[PDB]
């Protein structure tokens, strides 16, 4: 079947592992445990077609050249994580020597009340790149399916 290489990127503690674990395990992992590099391979049905999903959960260059699609993650209560976004985007495009890389912007921890980044700012930044913006919460599962689904669709469109 068709195989999709997805890479989840973002600053330390934005919820890269929590989002990945909520997606494929259906539970919220409320614990501190920073990542070096974890990967998961699962079969999933997208728009009626079974495909292989490869998800690389990264730490906050060989994975940027391997990946076919990137989930750019920030935390709504972490301003520095939002500022890092344009840097991750620029690194991926430089590594892949391309300005045609499937990407999705993700604003995580939406369930929290202590936001420091206005959602309007994330929507305008995503629109400036021509990429989708999804508000997510790895705790409530809000937008989690939408974020991974939207990115698989973008990789598939690029593959055809």
């Amino acid at each position, epitope marked *: *079947m068709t195989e999709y290489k997805l890479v989840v990127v973002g600053a330390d503690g934005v919820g890269k592992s929590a989002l990945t674990i909520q997606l*494929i395990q*259906n539970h919220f992992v409320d614990e501190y445990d920073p990542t070096i590099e974890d990967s998961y391979r*699962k*079969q*999933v*049905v*997208i*728009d*009626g*077609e*079974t495909s292989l999903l490869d998800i690389l959960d990264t730490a906050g260059d060989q994975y940027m050249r391997t990946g076919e699609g990137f989930l750019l993650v920030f935390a709504i209560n972490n301003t520095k994580s939002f500022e890092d976004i344009h840097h991750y985007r620029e690194q991926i495009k430089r590594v892949k020597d391309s300005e045609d890389v499937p990407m999705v912007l993700v604003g995580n921890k939406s369930d929290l009340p202590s936001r420091t980044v206005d959602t309007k700012q994330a929507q305008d930044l995503a629109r400036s790149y021509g990429i989708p913006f999804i508000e997510t919460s790895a705790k409530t599962r809000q937008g989690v*399916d939408d974020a*991974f*689904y939207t990115l*698989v669709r973008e990789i598939r469109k690029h593959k055809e």
Partner: nanobody
Amino acid sequence: VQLVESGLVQPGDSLRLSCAASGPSLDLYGTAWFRQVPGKEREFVSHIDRSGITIYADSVEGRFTISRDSRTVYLQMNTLAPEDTAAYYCAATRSNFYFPREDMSYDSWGQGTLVT
């Protein structure tokens, strides 16, 4: 959508199960077979997606064959062993994003069939 399913057999013998569907937009549905040993967890058996791609559990890989009438899904069971005695269920979903081996992905289910 509504699902309708179609007994005792010797080790090494064959049997066919059928899952008949009825309702709106039957062509958008992917169908899975699950089975359950009494007192145990429900386990994935095989699935045919909306586009016709088949997948199987490693335990039945090559032994069983799922197929579909271009309105019924079939589960062809051959070379049966004691470990295949279970209650068999078909399940279906028109979801555009789901993990096919997870029972929580399916909102429509057959009544079950007992295989010994």
